[PDB]
Structure formats: structure tokens, C-alpha cells
């Protein structure tokens, strides 16, 4: 404990080498506070360190960060860190309560006057003090509210200075003119609102114009780039090359998305006040999605969560005109590798939810584009199956709304296209059977071994690869299958079950699209009156391919009396019955001409899977 005493006396008698030693000792004390944070000596250290910190902090701000300037900057930083790191909880034996006014006032003045690296820490410390020392402090929150309102007011002017009116040796701007500090405001404001509830009613009204103005802000270069792209008929995505400071633009976009998240949070209860601002919201959302730099994946994820939150509050009806724009992949995702590799399922799931909740008022073009996009999504080669299942279930749900279009030609075409997509997926699944079996066996053996896995060439593991594997044989792994704990056979069976269950509903919806008077039905059996009619030669091919590919996927479930449950299982038998039932719903002539052609291939297939 002699080190602390000697450091304290040295600091007291103070009022490069000396400054270096003082800073080193102070930051070592900050590190070792863990051994001193708990105990009844907190008042002594607090009172013996407050005067020196107050005296030192009163000095003029320092912009330079070299030599003595950098040393004193680090000294101040690692001295201020104690207050945030200190356990300032509201516990009964708290000793910091009676001495908060002077310190919080000085910190507020510093925030008003200090630089970014200092003001950010100062506001964090102010928030942590606010969360705890509100018991006697509660008489001065008005100053903080006014300060944050002034920051929001001056956000526009600082943006104008940065863009319109515009490391060691760099001059540090004042904290009032930074975007990083601005982006931190919303969370602190939310925490302050949560803490106290007696000074909230007027502040919402005060902020509403400010948040509206903040969201309406825009940059001239990006605006003109968008306008010229629209004039050319295309869409501009990314950051305009004319921008001179890309980091500033990225921070500005981050602040904008943080403000959007704050608006979404406020919308939970005070939607009545934002009813005037609602109409322009989708345009701002689309512009933010288009303007987000491809490097900032976290900001895009936050924007996606904010969009989901706004959607779930039954404010979805205002998104209809922009659904067509939201369906483009350039606007939704962009060109970044991280986004395309990690966040595609989330974006497409939220878009699917929005579309499903509004399906009853979709124009034909929107239906066509959605069918195109999600048929493309179903055929994706994502490692898992949840993405494909989501796409398939959306298509199945949209079948009913497709069947209600005024034009029956388009409805029949779209339903046939969905059936074609399902047949293609069946063929793709058939292509992967041996690889799935091999991978299941290998994973079972690896799990049995129970040995830690090394990413090193090992002679005990010969590299067996085939058509499917050889294209994914590189060493770097983005996501290990071990964490997922997935077996390809099980996932394929799950997807197969879902698609087979949906087939019947799709066929039923198709049954009620017959073009009146297209084909004469003067005399038909009572068993053949409600079936689908009017297939051309190109649709019989789709039906035959559907049967051919579907029948061959039952290998995944691997004499015939089977009086007791043997060979096949109950699930397989019910799936087979469901598959067979689907073909009762078409023209008898089509049935004849399909199965006449298909019987020999079915005969061949039975020799490899006797349950057929």
C-alpha cells in the first residue's frame, strides 16, 4: 500500500519523466482498483482524489496528443475511467451521494467544452451517475435535456459545415461538431427517460420536430447522384465517389439509423404524435437502405431490426407502394460480402412477413415479382434448410392470393411456375443423395470418436471428396457444422415433407381456375367433374417431371406383405399416400398419357426402393 501513499503525496505536492511516472502510477491504480473497490475506505479515497481531479480538469482543453500532451490526455482518461468503473450502485452503504452536484456540473461543463475523446467518456460517466445518484440529483436533469436538444438542433448545422460549407498532427474538433458523439445520444436519452418519469411529457413533443428534421437531413452529393441515376433510369447504390471524407459519411449514416431506432422505440406508445410524420417514413427507410455503405454490416442489421419493430406495430399498411422497390436485391442487401454471407435470411424473412400480412391488397405486378424472387430463393445453395423452407412456405401461402387474380391466364401460369420450381428442387435434392449419406456417416463417426478437432493435415483423415464436396474443399471455414449439429438426411426429409404437404393445396387452388367454355364437358363421370382441365403439351411435361423426380426422393427413408410394421414406416406410408392422392385432380386423358409414358421408369425405380 506504500505505492498508493507515495503516489498520492507526489500528486498532492505536484500542485516528462515526472508526468510519465504520475500517469503510469495513476493508471496502475485504476487497473488495481479491483482490490480496493470493495471496502469501507471508499469515502477516504473519494474525498482525497476529488479536489485534485477538479483542479486539474479546470485547465484549458488540449488538442495536441504528442509527448506531454498525450501523456496528460492518457492520465485524464485513465483517471476519469475510475468513476465509470467504480461501483456507483445505489446500495445502502453508498458514500458518493452527498457529493454529486459539483462533479456532475463540472462534467456537464466539460462535455460542453471538451473534445470528442473526452466528451464521449464524460457523457458515459454522466449517464452512469444519472442511473445511480438520482436520489438527490434529480433537480438538474433539465440541463441535460436542454443540452441534448441543442445537440439535435445543431446536428443539421454541423452536417452543413462538414459537407456543404466545407492523424497525430490532426487538429481535434470540438465535441459539439462530431458524429460519433451524436450517435451515442439516443441510448443515453432512453436510459434517462427510463430512470425518471416526472419530466417526460413535454420532452416528447420537444423532440418530435427535432427527430423529424434529423431524419429529413440529406447530403447534396448523394442527393444529386440519386437524381441523376433516376434520370438515367437506373438506381445508385453505395457512397457517391464525390464524397471527400467517407468515414464522416459512414458516421452520419450510423447516427441516422440510431435516430431511426429511437423513433421506433418511441412509436410504441406515442404514435399519435408521429401520425403526421408517418407518410414519408418508407421513403426515408428506402433511402437509408440504399445509402448504407457496404462495409457497415452492423448498421444494416440494426436498421433491419428497427424496420421489423416498426412493422409489428400494425403500421404496415403504408408500405404497399414501396414493396416493389423493396423486392430488389441491390437495395435490400447491396454488394458487401459479410451481409450476403450472414444476414440474407433475416432480411428475406422480414420481407416475407410484411408481404404475408398485406397479401390481400397486392397488385398483379407485385405478385409476379414476389413469385420470381422466392422461386429464385428456394433454389439457393445455402448450407442449411431454414431459408429454403421459409421461401417454400411463403409460396404455398401466396398460392391462394394468386388464384384470385381477375385474369385466369396469369393465375394458371403462376401456379404452373410454382409447380415447376418444386420439381426443380426435387431434382436438386435427388442429385445430392450419396454425398448426404457419406456426410451423415462421417459425422456419426466423428461424434463417436470424441476428440478435439485440429485444422491441420492429418494422415488419420484421408481427404475423400466427390462432385458435391470438391467445390468446398478449401481450409478456411466461415461456420463450422459442429456448432449447427446438422445431419443432411434429416434436413432433407424435413424439407421434403413440407413441400409434399403443400403440393395438395397448390393443386386444389389450381382446380378452380378452369377457363369457362374452353373445353367441352358434355358427358363426364361424376368422379371426373371437379378436376383441372385444359393442359397444353408443355404442362404435361411439368406434371410428368414432377412425378418422376418426386418418386425418387423416397430413397432417403431407406417381402411386401408387411402385415406387421416392417420395411417402410408409418410416416413413409402416409407420405406415399399423400403423394399418390395429388394425381387424382387432373383430366383423365392427362392421367392416361402421363402414366403410360412413366410406367417403365417407375418399374426401374422399384428395383432400388421396394417401398414404392
Amino acid at each position: 500500500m506504500a505505492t498508493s501513499l507515495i503516489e498520492d503525496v507526489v500528486k498532492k505536492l505536484s500542485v516528462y519523466t515526472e508526468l510519465k511516472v504520475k500517469a503510469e502510477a495513476a493508471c496502475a491504480l485504476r487497473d488495481s482498483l479491483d482490490h480496493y473497490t470493495a471496502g469501507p475506505a471508499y469515502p477516504a479515497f473519494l474525498k482525497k482524489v476529488m479536489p485534485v481531479f477538479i483542479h486539474i480538469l479546470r485547465q484549458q482543453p488540449v488538442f495536441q496528443t504528442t509527448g506531454e500532451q498525450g501523456h496528460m490526455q492518457k492520465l485524464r482518461n485513465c483517471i476519469l475511467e475510475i468513476l465509470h468503473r467504480l461501483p456507483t450502485s445505489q446500495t445502502p452503504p453508498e458514500h458518493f451521494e452527498p457529493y454529486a452536484h459539483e462533479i456532475v456540473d463540472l462534467l456537464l461543463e466539460l462535455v460542453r467544452t471538451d473534445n470528442e475523446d473526452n466528451v464521449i467518456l464524460c457523457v458515459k460517466i454522466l449517464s452512469d451517475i444519472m442511473r445511480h445518484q438520482h436520489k438527490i440529483m434529480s433537480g438538474k436533469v433539465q440541463t441535460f435535456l436542454n443540452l441534448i436538444q441543442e445537440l439535435f438542433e445543431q446536428l443539421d448545422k454541423v452536417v452543413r459545415d462538414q459537407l456543404d460549407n466545407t492523424q497525430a498532427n490532426r487538429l481535434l474538433p470540438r465535441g459539439m461538431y462530431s458524429f460519433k458523439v451524436l450517435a451515442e445520444c439516443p441510448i443515453i436519452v432512453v436510459s434517462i427517460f427510463q430512470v425518471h418519469r416526472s419530466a417526460v411529457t413535454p420532452n416528447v413533443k420537444a423532440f418530435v420536430p427535432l427527430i423529424k428534421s434529423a431524419l429529413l437531413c440529406q447530403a447534396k452529393a448523394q442527393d444529386q447522384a440519386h437524381r441523376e441515376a433516376a434520370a438515367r433510369g437506373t438506381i445508385h447504390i453505395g457512397v457517391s465517389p464525390n464524397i471527400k471524407n467517407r468515414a464522416a459519411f459512414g458516421d452520419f449514416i450510423t447516427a441516422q439509423v440510431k435516430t431511426m431506432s429511437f423513433l421506433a422505440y418511441l412509436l410504441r406508445q406515442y404514435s399519435s404524435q408521429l401520425s403526421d410524420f408517418l407518410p414519408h417514413l418508407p421513403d426515408i427507410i428506402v433511402r437509408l437502405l440504399r445509402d448504407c455503405p457496404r462495409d457497415k454490416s452492423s448498421a444494416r442489421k440494426e436498421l433491419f431490426v428497427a424496420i421489423r419493430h416498426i412493422i409489428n406495430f400494425n403500421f404496415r399498411k403504408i408500405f404497399l407502394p414501396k414493396i416493389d422497390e423493396l423486392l430488389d436485391e441491390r437495395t435490400l442487401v447491396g454488394d458487401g460480402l459479410t451481409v450476403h454471407e450472414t444476414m440474407r435470411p433475416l432480411a428475406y424473412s422480414m420481407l416475407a412477413d410484411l408481404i404475408h400480412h398485406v397479401r390481400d391488397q397486392l397488385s398483379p405486378e407485385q405478385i409476379r415479382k414476389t413469385v420470381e424472387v422466392y422461386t429464385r430463393n428456394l433454389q439457393d445453395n445455402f448450407p442449411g434448410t431454414s431459408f429454403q423452407t421459409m421461401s417454400a412456405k411463403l409460396l404455398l401461402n401466396m398460392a391462394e392470393c394468386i388464384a384470385r387474380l381477375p385474369n385466369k391466364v396469369d393465375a394458371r401460369h403462376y401456379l404452373i411456375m410454382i409447380l415447376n420450381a418444386i420439381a426443380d428442387k426435387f431434382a436438386a435434392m435427388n442429385r445430392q443423395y450419396p454425398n448426404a449419406v457419406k456426410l451423415s456417416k462421417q459425422y456419426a463417426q466423428q461424434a463417436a470418436k470424441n476428440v478435439p478437432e485440429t485444422y491441420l493435415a492429418d494422415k488419420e483423415n484421408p481427404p475423400d471428396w466427390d462432385e458435391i464436396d470438391i467445390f468446398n474443399a478449401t481450409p478456411i471455414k466461415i461456420s463450422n457444422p459442429r456448432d449447427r449439429a446438422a445431419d443432411p438426411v434429416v434436413d432433407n426429409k424435413f424439407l421434403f415433407r413440407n413441400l409434399m404437404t403443400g403440393l395438395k393445396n397448390t393443386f386444389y387452388q389450381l382446380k378452380s381456375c378452369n377457363i369457362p367454355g374452353a373445353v367441352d364437358l358434355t358427358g363426364a363421370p361424376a368422379h371426373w367433374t371437379d378436376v383441372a382441365y385444359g393442359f397444353t403439351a408443355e404442362e404435361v411435361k411439368v406434371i410428368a417431371k414432377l412425378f418422376r423426380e418426386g418418386a425418387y426422393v423416397f430413397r432417403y427413408y431407406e417381402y411386401m406383405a408387411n402385415f406387421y410394421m416392417v420395411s417402410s414406416s408409418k410416416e413413409e406410408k402416409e407420405l406415399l399416400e399423400t403423394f399418390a392422392t395429388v394425381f387424382h385432380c387432373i383430366d383423365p386423358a392427362t392421367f392416361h398419357e402421363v402414366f403410360q409414358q412413366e410406367i417403365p421408369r417407375l418399374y426401374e425405380m422399384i428395383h432400388e426402393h421396394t417401398a414404392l
Binding site: 487497473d31 401460369h413 491441420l456 493435415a457 474443399a473 471455414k477
Partner: protein, 632 residues
């Protein structure tokens, strides 16, 4: 015109479905292929817009597939003509045609499976030439690297896994020099400005994958290019893309594990890896750390007699600095759990941290499975350290204070009590729990912390709230048939708590049990009267099969043996009498079994009740059921 195009495509496709006629020679002509490509592009453009009559949509959709198949069939003849292949790939990656599995199915089975080291080097060199040029867009370069170059090298690696240190006759000096000069030696004048193009990150990832594969599988061939490889990998560290940055870290880790590097770079990379906070690319960070860790003692030697390595002090510093963010702590603990031997020496600066942070990692209210697993793994790491210490001593060592041991024991007891999975028992109606119980048993051994059990009570708060609580008492005393009073979680908690008290009492002394009898009676009276077979199974049964290779005596037998050769015997006899009177045979028969095994002289006054039960209910139902089965 589009009807004519569709009909022509249909006829030409039909003409090539029976290749066993040597009639495919019309596919050798080039002008026909150019005309086909032109008409195909026209039709594809018409389909892209909705500018076709509604009568020709499906026919055109099928015509596109037929045309792609025709082009692939033409490509199949003369597989060595790479100009045709590159033109087709340019068309496909430029959004002019629609892809079909045939192109990849031909690339495989013609190029990748080629049975000649010739035509592999030429293909790789041509692909690298295209990549080096500034004309082949970005998707074409990615396609080539992903689908031709890397698979060829993988096939070469697979085909030469032989004992006699077989070399790679494919990877000659020319190939290595070309790769180095075209990728590694290329010091970009402004690579940060190269990002202005789209889709460049994917090809950057492809080149990173190629470099990583080379280092992993043919490390012996990079002796003259070690320096250039290090410079290239260090340069790629600056990319703004998270995935690219972590892939570069993985490449650096591979080189470090396979080559000698100055300790400064290794320490810098270690500090950068341990300081990462972004949740994205956690697996890449894990892979890099696993690659780097095993070679730390060799890469960063420390003076003999020193037990504070820099590579060991770095995690301590990061934990101290970033103790506020929970993700940092979780990541460092995940790293630490995997390497017990490495930190065996420096445990003196981590045991207390782990013990105090165990509560932080997992919270009583509702933690996730991963948090519970991590906490259990931390406790297992401490157990491994202690076991290693004791084994080394047997064949001034740092020891935890009694406060830490006490706190860890309380946390473990609460964790076991509040766990989700249920203890396996024979009476159960038709891993974490087993591991936790085994750890608890192992810790309390005499040579181990077992010396702390003398002053350890029965954890009054948890034991009371989970056994003597009114809700617990009424649920346990309720009818097992009713699902309303069959809350699975509560019964699981009771079973786990009973196992805990059994284990602790197994290690207690006779004097302590004798003195504290009334507390034990208060804690066990409610459960001893239960009609649930599983509670009685916990109380009376002790089987090696379900105890995980442990010899722990039943709690009832333990307390009965504690009695000198009393009040406990009379009290148990009273419970047995009151249970048998009401017809609750599950409790009475089990208690009487225990009592008789203790001292037979107590069953003389109970013989009539046992006989009455046998002739009334049990045997009657047994024989009646078997008679019914025979009749059926």
C-alpha cells in the same frame, strides 16, 4: 420470329438426343454456334422483360434450357478448347444466359478429373492470365478461381496421399512463380481504391482460400517466398471487410503454425485476436486462435524460473480492461477452457477471476444452454487444475482461499438444484446433470476440498425453499395422476435437490448427523410420505448403473447407520404405520424394507400389515392381470 426461334431450337435439340450416330459433326462448325448464341441472347432478353405474348412464356422458358444444353454438348466435343469454355463463362457471368447443371457437370468429369498432369498446368496458367488482366470483370474471375483452379489443386492433393513422401509433379516452379508474381508480390499502389468496384470481396476471399490451402498442404514449397507471403498476408489485414480480415488472420495463423516468425508479430496478432468484439466471424477467430496457440511456447520462449509469460499476461490484461463488456469475457473464457495445460502454471492469476465471474456468465433467472455449458466448463477447468496439482504432488503451491471454495460450492449447488435435465432413475416413466453430480462428488473427497465439509450446513435457503415450501409440499403430497400437480420442473428440482443432499450427507460425520437430527427430520419428513415412486427411489435406492460409477450409499441407510447400535427408528416406524394404514404402499413398503435391513426386530409388529397388503392388493392384481392376459 420468336415462334420460329423456339421451333428451330426444339428441332436442333431433338437432333442431338441420340449421339451414337456420329451425326454430331454439325456441332463442330462455329458460325452455327455464333448464330445460336445470338438468337438465345435475343430470346433471353425478351423473357427478362414481360414483352412476350402470354401464349409463348413456358415454351420460351424450356427453349432457354434446351439452348444451354446444346451449347454444353458442343463444348463437350474437343474438351481442350478453352476459348469456347471461356466465352461461355463470359456469357453466363455477364447475365446473358441462364445457367444449368450441365456446365458444372462437364467441368467436373472433363477438367478436374483429367487423367494427365498436362492440360492442368496450361489451364491454371491461362486462368491466372485472365485473372491478372483488367478485362474479365469481377464475376468471371471469381467463377474461374472457385470452379477450376482450387478444385484442381484439391484433386491433386487427394491423388498423391502416399507413404513415400510423394511430391507434386503438377506444382512445378513455373506455377509457384506465376502465383507469387501475380498475387503475393503485387503491392497494390492503392488497394483501398480498388474497392470502388463491386463484387471484389468475393475474389479476394477466393485468393485467400487458395493461399491458405497452399500453406496448409504444400508448406515445403514456399521456402523462397516466405517473405512475400508474409508481406501479402500482413497487407490483407487492413481490409475493411470483417470476413476478409478474419480470413487473413487465419492465413497468418497457418503460416505461424507452419513457419518461424519473430515474436513481435506473433504477440501483435495475439493481442489483436483477443481484443476482437464483433460477433460476426467468431468461428474464424476461434480457428486462428486454435492454430496459433499450440506453438506459443516455442514461438515466444520465456526465461527459466519465470511463470508470467507475456502470451499468458495478455488475456489477463484484456480481461481487466474490458471487464464491462460481457462478450469479451465470454470469448476469453471460451478460449481459456480449451487449453488447461497451458495455463496450469499461471492458474494463480486466473482461479479467483473464474470463481468470481462464474456468477456473471450464468444468471439464476433464465440462462441459455451455452451459458450453462460455459459455466460448467469453467468449473471443470478448475477441477482439472486441482487434480493435476494433487497428482503431481503425489508423484508453496498456490491454493485457493476458503472463501473462493465456499462460493464455488454454493454456486455449484444452486446450479444443480435449478438445472433443467432430470436425474435418471429406474422408476422414471418411459449429460449436464451427470457431469455436475460427478464434479460435486469428486470435489468433496478428503484429499480434495472435502476438508471443508465439517462446517458446511445443508444450504438452508435452497433446501427449505425447494423441499419445505408450501407449494413443493402440496405438489409432492398430491396425487401423481393429476397433471395439474405434476409440474415437471418442480419435481425435477426436488429430485436434483434430493441427490445433492444425499451426496453431501455421504461425506458427513456421524457426530454431525447425530447432533443435527431434527433438521434432517424436518427436511425429509414431507418427502418420506410421498406416493411417487421416483421420490422413494431417490431416498432408498443406490445403484452403480445410475450413479455414474460411484459408490454412494442411500441417505436413509446413511442416517440409519449413523444411529448407535432410538428416536429416529420410532419416528420412521410411525411413518411406516401411518402410510400402511392409509393404503399408500409405495412409502410404507420402502420404509419397511430400509428398517428391516437396518434391524429385523422392528418388523414383528408390522408383519400383519404386510400380509394384509399382499393378500388384498398386490398379489391379487398381479394374478388377475396375468389371468386376463391368458384369457386374451
Amino acid at each position: 420470329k420468336f415462334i420460329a426461334i423456339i421451333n428451330t431450337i426444339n428441332m436442333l435439340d431433338a437432333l442431338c438426343q441420340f449421339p451414337t450416330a456420329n451425326s454430331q459433326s454439325w456441332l463442330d462448325n462455329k458460325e452455327h454456334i455464333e448464330w445460336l448464341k445470338t438468337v438465345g441472347k435475343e430470346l433471353e432478353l425478351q423473357q427478362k422483360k414481360n414483352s412476350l405474348t402470354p401464349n409463348l412464356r413456358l415454351p420460351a422458358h424450356q427453349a432457354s434450357e434446351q439452348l444451354m444444353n446444346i451449347l454444353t454438348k458442343a463444348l463437350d466435343r474437343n474438351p481442350n478448347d478453352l476459348d469456347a469454355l471461356f466465352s461461355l463463362v463470359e456469357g453466363i457471368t455477364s447475365d446473358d444466359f441462364r445457367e444449368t447443371p450441365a456446365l458444372l457437370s462437364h467441368i467436373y468429369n472433363k477438367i478436374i478429373r483429367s487423367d494427365s498432369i498436362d492440360f492442368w498446368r496450361i489451364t491454371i496458367l491461362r486462368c491466372l492470365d485472365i485473372y491478372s488482366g483488367k478485362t474479365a470483370s469481377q464475376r468471371m474471375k471469381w467463377y474461374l478461381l472457385h470452379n477450376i483452379v482450387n478444385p484442381i489443386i484439391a484433386m491433386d492433393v487427394m491423388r498423391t496421399w502416399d507413404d513415400p513422401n510423394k511430391a507434386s509433379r503438377l506444382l512445378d516452379r513455373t506455377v509457384i512463380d506465376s502465383i507469387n508474381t501475380k498475387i503475393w508480390k503485387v503491392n497494390l499502389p492503392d488497394p483501398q481504391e480498388d474497392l470502388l468496384q463491386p463484387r471484389v470481396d468475393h475474389t479476394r476471399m477466393e485468393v485467400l482460400q487458395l493461399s491458405a490451402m497452399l500453406v496448409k498442404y504444400r508448406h515445403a514449397l514456399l521456402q523462397d517466398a516466405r517473405k512475400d507471403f508474409i508481406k501479402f498476408a500482413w497487407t490483407y489485414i487492413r481490409l475493411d471487410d470483417v470476413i476478409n480480415k478474419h480470413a487473413a488472420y487465419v492465413v497468418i495463423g497457418y503460416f505461424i503454425a507452419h513457419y518461424e516468425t519473430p515474436a513481435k508479430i506473433v504477440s501483435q496478432i495475439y493481442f489483436s485476436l483477443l481484443k476482437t468484439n464483433q460477433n460476426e466471424g467468431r468461428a474464424l477467430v476461434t480457428q486462428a486462435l486454435e492454430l496459433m496457440a499450440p506453438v506459443m511456447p516455442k514461438r515466444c520462449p520465456f526465461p527459466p524460473g519465470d511463470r508470467n509469460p507475456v502470451w499468458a499476461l495478455a488475456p489477463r490484461r484484456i480481461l481487466a480492461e474490458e471487464s464491462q463488456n460481457v462478450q469479451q469475457m465470454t470469448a476469453i473464457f471460451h478460449y481459456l477452457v480449451r487449453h488447461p495445460d497451458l495455463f496450469y502454471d499461471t492458474r494463480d492469476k486466473f482461479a479467483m477471476l473464474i470463481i468470481q465471474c462464474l456468477r456473471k456468465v450464468a444468471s439464476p433467472p433464465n440462462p441459455s444452454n451455452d451459458n450453462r455449458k460455459l459455466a460448467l466448463n469453467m468449473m471443470w477447468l478448475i477441477w482439472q487444475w486441482e487434480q493435476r496439482r494433487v497428482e503431481s504432488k503425489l508423484s508453496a503451491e498456490f491454493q485457493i482461499p476458503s472463501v473462493g471454495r465456499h462460493k464455488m460450492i454454493r454456486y455449484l449447488v444452486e446450479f444443480i438444484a435449478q438445472l433443467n435435465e432430470r436425474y435418471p432413475l429406474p422408476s422414471a416413466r418411459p449429460e449436464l446433470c451427470k457431469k455436475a453430480t460427478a464434479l460435486l462428488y469428486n470435489l468433496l473427497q478428503p484429499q480434495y476440498w472435502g476438508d471443508l465439509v465439517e462446517e458446511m450446513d445443508l444450504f438452508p435457503n435452497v433446501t427449505d425453499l425447494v423441499l419445505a415450501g408450501e407449494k413443493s409440499a402440496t405438489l409432492l403430497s398430491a396425487d401423481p395422476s393429476d397433471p395439474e400437480k405434476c409440474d415437471d420442473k418442480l419435481i425435477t428440482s426436488i429430485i436434483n435437490t434430493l441427490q445433492v443432499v444425499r451426496i453431501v450427507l455421504h461425506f458427513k460425520s456421524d457426530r454431525w448427523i447425530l447432533d443435527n437430527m431434527p433438521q434432517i427430520q424436518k427436511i425429509l419428513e414431507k418427502c418420506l410420505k410421498s406416493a411417487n415412486p421416483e421420490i422413494q427411489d431417490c431416498l432408498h435406492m443406490a445403484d452403480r448403473k445410475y450413479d455414474g460409477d460411484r459408490d454412494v450409499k442411500p441417505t436413509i441407510k446413511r442416517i440409519l447407520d449413523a444411529v448407535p447400535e432410538s428416536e429416529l427408528i420410532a419416528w420412521l416406524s410411525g411413518i411406516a404405520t401411518e402410510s400402511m394404514a392409509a393404503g399408500n404402499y409405495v412409502s410404507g413398503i420402502n420404509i419397511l424394507w430400509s428398517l428391516g435391513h437396518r434391524k429385523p426386530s422392528i418388523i414383528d409388529q408390522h408383519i400383519p400389515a404386510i400380509m394384509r397388503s399382499l393378500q388384498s392388493k398386490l398379489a391379487r392384481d398381479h394374478v388377475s392381470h396375468y389371468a386376463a392376459l391368458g384369457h386374451q
